Amino acid sequence: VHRDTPENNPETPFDFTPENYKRIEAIVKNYPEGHKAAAVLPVLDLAQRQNGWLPISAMNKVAEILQVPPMRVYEVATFYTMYNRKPVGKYHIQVCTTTPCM
Amino acid sequence: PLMGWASTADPLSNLVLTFSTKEDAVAFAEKNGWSYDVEERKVPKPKSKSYGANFSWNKRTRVSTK
Amino acid sequence: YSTYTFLDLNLDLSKFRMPQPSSGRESP
Amino acid sequence: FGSLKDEDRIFTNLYGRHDWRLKGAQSRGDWYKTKEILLKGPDWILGEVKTSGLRGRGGAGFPTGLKWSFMNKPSDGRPKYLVVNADEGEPGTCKDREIIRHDPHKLVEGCLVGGRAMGARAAYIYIRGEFYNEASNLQVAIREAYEAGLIGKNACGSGYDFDVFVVRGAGAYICGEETALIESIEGKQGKPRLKPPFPADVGVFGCPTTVANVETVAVSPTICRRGGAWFASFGRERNSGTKLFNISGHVNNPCTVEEEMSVPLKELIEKHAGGVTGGWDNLLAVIPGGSSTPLIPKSVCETVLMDFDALIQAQTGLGTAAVIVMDRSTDIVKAIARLIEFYKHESCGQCTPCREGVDWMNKVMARFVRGDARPAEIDSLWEISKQIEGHTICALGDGAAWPVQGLIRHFRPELEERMQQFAQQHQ
Ligand SMILES: Cc1cc2nc3c(=O)[nH]c(=O)nc-3n(C[C@H](O)[C@H](O)[C@H](O)COP(=O)(O)O)c2cc1C
Ligand code: SF4
């Protein structure tokens, strides 16, 4: 795997279902005001859910919602694991292999 | 105009003496008797820098992705 | 068990019943 | 320690498991006396746990009793929160998620009854999103009670009540530290801060927080509900209580059991239920901690009680509260590399000792196991491990070497002969 994008879907395009703009009212409701500025962890992942893997125009979209310069997103999606930047299948299966599982 | 070495007169041109201080700096220009000039030493502001002010409630200084 | 559909979980009882928030500002 | 046990009765600190999963009046145990507790002065709860003095389940010492009556004594301008790990970082831990799976009604109380001591404002929990199904249900458990009016904003009978906001991670180790979790609760990348800013109770979300653990805030209400004088039951004058162990990797029926302190490993492993591998002649090479403690051979471990400071007597102690063992076929050198190959993937990567310093080992560990170039390396590889201690910020480095530090201890030859096994082979 490599962490650079070869201009796949700069304009995919992508958008959220108008059923989802009523939840993002609730998420931001969690946090205090003025620091809000990152709900990114659910909000960026909810977008994975609506789609099933998020292209680069998904990473650019939430920035327009969250007003953070979108290297403060492309970063967070390349740190964690659960998000899948490339495409996937209908079932993405795991085999735990570790000292006990070994 | 044979190679491009830059040949020169001005037989001093390369000397740097090293003194220990100003009071004893000008000491050697007069005593040998030529004109001169002076610059001044510089050292920074005090200054005030504190990590741990980088995470702030109402302050405007709050870093991200450090 | 519900693969998609976090909705009412997030937006039904939570949306109305998460008061206020005040949360202040932080304008900044 | 008394009778060298650690028994298990129906008198324990956990109410029920197979009885009732859903909501209700907390038919017998829970939500019993509340308005009397909270209405009395808050510091009555503070130091009232000292009758027990819980060391804490966060994988360390530092009894939970101090840090809450610790700073966060005053209050000035800015709210205080609660962040209680639900996460599991250590391989084979598994103690967590059993508390939540069949009995969530306990912990929402555990905060509310607990949070009053902090004088806190809100309640955050945190859960690795890798548990989608079980973690999804807490919200119901929140609602199925909270909706009844049991919590917030006065509930019940006080002027102080506040709700709990679940969150989730993804590829986290982040519970691997406080002062990381409070960072990735925020939405930055998670690189844990420096430990002494202002340690974790000054620099925080916007404002002071305290990072608790699961059964540190789980068992607090029931230990403030009854307490005693039974709060100190088993274990010596130092460590006292009954925690949960979860056995894994060789047994008849590896499964959790509530067991009090100072229990020897030779009766405990064999019990609950059997020893199904060789109870002896299977060589019983054991790991006290989950990933945080190196091996013990057949020596005094089997008589060594599981009391904390009893383990510091051996070359390593364990706060993780887990057990992994081995018998015969498992090649330890083969079975410890995939404990190290794990570390290389879970590390932040800020610090120069951790990053670029763990791989130097992990790249060589695939020499020994395979069998490959000559000894005198072992003598160096020990020094590397001796060279990362005060040099890293978080504990993940201090938890990086011990497995290798304590492999070179306790087994000399198994390596020495294998480097020959390929040496004679080359010939
Ligand atoms: C690799 C690693 C993984 C960890 N995983 C967890 C975890 O899953 N849950 C947890 O509560 N603490 C975990 N910690 C340790 C945190 O320091 C701990 O949660 C925090 O100190 C809270 O301690 P306390 O609430 O018991 O006082 C982990 C530490 C490391 C180094
Ligand atoms: S060890 Fe160094 S790099 Fe790995 S996580 Fe702790 S700090 Fe970040």
Side-chain angles (χ1 to χ4, degrees), chain A residues 1-11 13-18 20-35 37-63 65-102, chain B residues 1-38 40-66, chain C residues 1-2 4-6 9 17-21 23-24 27-28, chain D residues 1-5 7-12 14-22 24-25 29-35 37-38 40-56 58-68 70-72 74 76-83 85-89 91-94 96-107 109-111 114-133 135-143 145-149 151-160 162 165-174 176 179-194 196-197 199-201 203 205-215 217-218 220-222 224-230 232-233 235 238-239 241 243-245 247 249-250 253-254 256 258 261-264 266-267 270-275 277-280 283-292 294-297 299 301-303 306 308-311 314-317 319-325 329 331-413 415-416 418 420 422-427:
Chain A
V1 292
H2 303 290
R3 281 176 287 193
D4 293 348
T5 298
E7 293 177 350
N8 186 30
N9 287 334
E11 185 69 15
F14 176 81
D15 189 1
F16 295 164
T17 294
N20 290 336
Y21 293 85
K22 62 193 184 71
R23 300 178 192 173
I24 301 170
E25 177 179 1
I27 288 175
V28 176
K29 223 130 175 147
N30 290 341
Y31 299 92
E33 180 64 10
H35 285 282
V40 297
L41 298 181
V43 169
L44 189 143
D45 183 68
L46 184 148
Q48 185 189 1
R49 186 55 52 80
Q50 179 180 352
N51 190 34
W53 60 268
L54 34 70
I56 189 170
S57 180
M59 295 173 181
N60 291 342
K61 178 57 178 170
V62 300
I65 310 302
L66 298 171
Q67 68 276 359
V68 297
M71 192 70 174
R72 301 286 174 265
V73 169
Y74 308 155
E75 183 182 8
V76 171
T78 54
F79 184 64
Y80 298 157
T81 297
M82 293 292 286
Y83 308 105
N84 50 344
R85 298 173 299 102
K86 284 162 59 185
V88 291
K90 181 186 294 295
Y91 295 99
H92 183 202
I93 191 167
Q94 294 82 357
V95 177
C96 288
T97 173
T98 308
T99 308
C101 294
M102 187 70 180
Chain B
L2 202 148
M3 293 304 176
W5 310 335
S7 53
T8 193
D10 185 357
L12 292 177
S13 68
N14 291 327
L15 284 180
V16 60
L17 305 172
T18 53
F19 297 178
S20 298
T21 184
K22 179 63 180 300
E23 170 275 340
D24 190 11
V26 177
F28 190 75
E30 303 303 324
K31 184 175 81 179
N32 195 26
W34 44 54
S35 172
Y36 64 91
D37 176 70
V38 176
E40 293 302 324
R41 179 180 286 183
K42 290 297 290 187
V43 289
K45 300 294 191 296
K47 58 182 62 183
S48 175
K49 290 183 66 67
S50 69
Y51 170 86
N54 288 347
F55 307 91
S56 295
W57 173 246
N58 60 342
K59 295 299 290 186
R60 188 175 284 115
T61 308
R62 185 179 180 279
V63 291
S64 62
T65 298
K66 58 198 189 73
Chain C
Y1 58 90
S2 64
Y4 183 74
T5 66
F6 192 83
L9 282 64
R17 287 187 174 177
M18 286 173 63
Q20 293 180 337
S23 295
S27 56
Chain D
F1 58 90
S3 60
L4 184 70
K5 62 191 69 178
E7 294 180 353
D8 178 65
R9 293 189 300 276
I10 188 58
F11 176 77
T12 55
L14 274 68
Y15 169 84
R17 179 175 59 196
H18 193 287
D19 183 5
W20 59 278
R21 187 182 186 280
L22 276 71
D30 304 340
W31 292 90
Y32 178 82
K33 178 179 75 179
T34 60
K35 292 183 295 296
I37 299 172
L38 298 175
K40 191 173 184 177
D43 289 347
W44 177 78
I45 305 172
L46 277 71
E48 188 275 338
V49 181
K50 297 294 182 64
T51 63
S52 60
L54 292 170
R55 299 297 303 282
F62 183 78
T64 58
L66 200 154
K67 59 179 177 182
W68 307 358
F70 183 76
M71 180 63 185
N72 298 335
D76 178 8
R78 58 190 58 79
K80 290 176 292 297
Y81 299 93
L82 183 146
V83 188
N85 299 338
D87 181 71
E88 64 177 345
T93 301
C94 184
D96 295 343
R97 181 187 65 84
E98 297 302 323
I99 304 170
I100 288 171
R101 186 171 178 270
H102 60 78
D103 189 4
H105 297 291
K106 194 68 170 293
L107 176 58
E109 175 62 15
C111 295
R116 179 61 181 171
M118 294 300 302
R121 179 175 179 272
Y124 290 130
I125 73 109
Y126 177 82
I127 291 174
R128 179 189 294 175
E130 188 75 9
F131 307 152
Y132 182 72
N133 291 333
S136 61
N137 196 40
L138 294 176
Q139 192 66 56
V140 176
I142 298 300
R143 179 184 294 176
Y146 177 80
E147 181 278 335
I151 308 98
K153 57 184 175 296
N154 60 343
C156 183
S158 66
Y160 178 86
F162 299 98
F165 311 156
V166 178
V167 298
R168 287 185 293 271
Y173 75 82
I174 288 113
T179 314
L181 180 62
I182 180 60
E183 195 189 17
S184 290
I185 197 69
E186 177 61 11
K188 296 174 182 174
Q189 195 173 359
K191 304 186 176 314
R193 295 181 181 84
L194 279 73
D201 199 357
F205 182 93
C207 52
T209 61
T210 52
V211 176
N213 191 21
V214 181
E215 57 264 358
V217 295
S220 174
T222 188
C224 186
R225 182 179 291 178
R226 178 181 62 256
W230 182 84
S233 65
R238 180 64 59 179
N239 57 342
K243 296 290 184 291
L244 284 69
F245 302 164
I247 298 98
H250 291 293
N253 59 340
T256 54
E258 176 66 12
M261 300 298 103
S262 295
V263 47
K266 192 61 173 170
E267 64 175 339
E270 289 176 345
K271 291 166 64 180
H272 300 291
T277 58
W280 180 250
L283 280 66
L284 274 66
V286 63
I287 298 101
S291 63
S292 176
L295 302 171
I296 302 177
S299 176
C301 182
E302 61 187 346
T303 62
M306 295 297 104
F308 291 161
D309 298 344
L311 288 176
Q315 287 183 336
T316 300
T320 61
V323 177
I324 54 174
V325 300
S329 295
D331 181 67
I332 304 98
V333 182
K334 173 61 164 59
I336 189 168
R338 294 311 301 266
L339 190 140
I340 300 169
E341 176 70 15
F342 164 79
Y343 284 142
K344 180 176 76 177
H345 302 299
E346 204 187 10
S347 60
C348 175
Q350 286 180 317
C351 308
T352 58
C354 171
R355 172 182 59 87
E356 287 177 352
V358 174
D359 311 351
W360 199 103
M361 288 186 281
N362 183 34
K363 190 177 300 299
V364 77
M365 289 295 292
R367 175 171 292 103
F368 296 153
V369 172
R370 178 181 176 85
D372 189 58
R374 295 192 302 273
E377 294 177 351
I378 298 102
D379 196 356
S380 66
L381 187 144
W382 188 82
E383 284 192 350
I384 305 311
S385 50
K386 297 303 289 182
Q387 193 167 348
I388 305 165
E389 287 84 358
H391 310 278
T392 60
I393 301 172
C394 297
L396 191 150
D398 291 346
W402 290 351
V404 172
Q405 193 179 3
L407 170 64
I408 304 299
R409 292 172 180 169
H410 300 172
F411 303 172
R412 187 64 184 172
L415 303 168
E416 288 293 329
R418 184 176 298 176
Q420 187 60 58
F422 178 74
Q424 60 176 17
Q425 184 63 59
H426 182 67
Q427 295 169 334

